[model samples]
Target: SLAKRIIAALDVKDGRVVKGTNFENLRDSGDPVELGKFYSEIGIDELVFHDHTASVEKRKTMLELVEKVAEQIDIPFTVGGGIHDFETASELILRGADKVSINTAAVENPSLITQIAQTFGSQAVVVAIDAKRVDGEFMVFTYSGKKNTGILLRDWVVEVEKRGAGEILLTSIDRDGTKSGYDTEMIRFVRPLTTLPIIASGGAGKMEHFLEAFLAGADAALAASVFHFREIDVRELKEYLKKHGVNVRL
Candidate 1:
């Protein structure tokens, strides 16, 4: 089996890590830079920095914070939030962001994905797909789940990979912050459709959830509440995965 990576998600709103249930009613988790350093020192595989409010606020201003986290941590980092165009994407990359996660903006102008990939390699572009089970079908959503784009999950994955996205961050809005577990069904649906690596996000409540995602074909597992609240440390989770016969680069 391939080694699965553990990516720690830092959801930032006003320069702090915030936690919420299903992307609503956010609570302050901690400072992004501090949290990034903490996770990096404790053996996090990678860091995912998301500006949770950039889209709703209608602007992109995460560069300063991105640089701050970059200075604080030596590990690889990915940034998403208000990355609506190539210019912003370039700026993020310049500020120590190893990869860029595109959401609403990419959905509106998909050329941005190809353009970024052309300029900064496909490995530097991560297409974040947020989906909810609607009427028994996986439906894509945008604008922090405020609007539904009505795109089929599998179809979008195929399209994004075709456009040169190196990875897909598949977040299940229905399972987010619930801690019950990740959306394994969605993982099963998306794995065979796209050749790109998939990062499973949302509903990660325990060590078993991480193993399940790895077993279900996710290249990486991302979570928020579970780590932020100290329910499970990254080291313990890695040990558990290794014990369960999953290859993890601890």
Candidate 2:
């Protein structure tokens, strides 16, 4: 089995690192450049930097910031927000992002997924899904969780993979920043839908939460508050997972 990955998420707003709960009540975290350096040095497998408002505001991702962060971090860096076309995605790549994540843009024009994959290869494309359970069904949201696209989460996961997306970054809007645990059922629900790797995001409150996500078939477990707030350290989290028999990089 491929070793499970622990990814640190840096939600950037106006070039500063921030965190929020259930996609609301945003609060400052720290400098993205500094935090990126810290996580890269401390043993995070990968890092995702999201420009929280760029899509809604109709602005491009902070590539300058991405370049700065990329220069400091040795791990793979994924960047997202306001990337609407091949040009934007390519620019992010040229600016040093190892991969470019698309949510609103992919939802708006799913052909963009294939276009990116063809232009940059599947490994360079990640589709981020922000989903919430409504009346017992998961629905995908867009525009940083402000708009409901009415896309069924399971079906969309399959579609992205078919379009050549290399990975899925699945975030549970219901469990985001709650620190309770991951929505393992969600992970299990989509696991069989596609063979592409899935990164479980949100609702990670403790070390066991990471283990639970992996057990449920998530290839990677991503958290913002737990790492951003220093509630859990990446090095120790890996130690805990390693001791528990989860294949992790240490």
Candidate 3:
């Protein structure tokens, strides 16, 4: 059976899990340790921790929290946000993170991807892409920076694969208000560019949205809001997927 995964993302701000509202103020959702523990126990395939704005002083906070959560969760744990060097990535992996995700840093310094990938092997590096559409075309961007870098999503996606990324977290900024689903078109376009697993993220408001992502060539479906708010149960979604003839851990 083909494996399709459901991953829950935790947006950490100063060691607390927070979710954005109206893209302005970020509201506290919960604690990273307990939330990760509960999600792992509830059969979520994996957990990704994102530290929104990582400063030099905040680095220690993220590292300690990563240790706390890694020890609490049994499932695969990935840490992201402001990871710019091999040493930091090695620190995260040493603290029990299964993989390190990089977006902003990777865009600015493509060599960082190769550095981490070479040191930890490709499987330990995941390239998280924020694909934002500017007018008629799509480009890569950083959530914290809030500005598009104008690099074609296609160009960066292909580059990362060649640079040795194990997986791609293709998050769509275009489908925000559409209320439709993940950016299936972008996933479809990115699918042939690389052989790595594509983790479809963003705009997942319902069960069918996940299915649409998988059908569109995503190997895993990732959603932060739906999972964080408990709008849908992980097991419920898995069961629905199984009955719909999609292979998922049951």
Candidate 4:
């Protein structure tokens, strides 16, 4: 059985937690530290901190804040945004990040995937794929979903796995923040192409949606609004999945 992992995503911008729909109309959610710490004690399996403004000038500031939050949490914490090279990834790990995510950098230079994996075991490397439905095709998006790579979603995921990415965080920009549900079609399309664990992102509105994602081949599910607004608790979500025969740590 595929295990159901719960990963809380913290989208940081301007040193505060913010979220937007379809990557537009951004709004501040709350303090990153407060949210991060709250999730840590609420039974989250892992925490992902992404500086949504990677292409902007907020990279250094996000890194410093991540260090502060890392010291306060005891669970696995992954930091991402503006990480282009092995050195940048290494700095985050050295600062206490259990794993590091790369997006724009990986799209620009696929070799960075293998380089980081080789340097810091593949398990410490998480490749986040942001894609949108363009002309009825799932095309890869970069720079926070502002640009398209013109690559097919399944092909890109397979290549990233081959390049040594231990896990893939797939976010469907079209369905993000819609509360519609996880992209089962996209998950099914890429699940059989690679054996690496896949974390489904975007459109988790309820506990049943999480179950649907697990059955659709997601090893884990990442949610933002639902958790931020108290729509669901991590522990209760895990228990619900367990009742449905999904393997989840309680």
For this target, which candidate reaches the highest lDDT against the unseen true structure? 2
Off by over 4 Å in 1: 19-29, 53-61
Candidate achieving higher lDDT, 1 or 3:
1
lDDT of candidates 1 onward, in order: 0.85, 0.86, 0.83, 0.84
Task: Report how far off residue 107 is in candidate 3 (Å).
Answer: 1.4
Return the candidate ranking by TM-score, descending: 1, 3, 2, 4
Poorest 10 consecutive residues of model 3 by lDDT? 20-29
Write one digit per residue (lDDT tens) for candidate 4, span 53-94.
645566577668778888888888888877888888987887
Tens digits of per-residue lDDT, candidate 2, 1-250, equal: 5689999888788777774323222332367887777777888999998786645443444777778888888899899877888998898888899999999999889899999999889999999999999889999999889998888998899899988999999999999869889999999999999999999998999999999999999999998878777788788999999998899988
lDDT tens per residue, model 1, 45-164? 899988866454423458778778888789888998767789889988987799999999988888888999998999999999999998999999998878889898878888898889
- In candidate 3, residue 119 scores what lDDT? 81
Model 3, runs deviating above 4 Å:
19-29, 53-56, 143-145, 176-179
> What residue pairs are clashing in model 3?
none
Summed backbone clashes in each candidate are 0, 0, 0, 0
Give lDDT: candidate 2, residue 161.
92
Q: Model 1's lDDT to the true fold? A: 0.85
| lDDT per residue (tens digit) for residues 174-197 in model 3 | 775355688998899889888899
Question: What pairs collide in candidate 2?
Answer: none
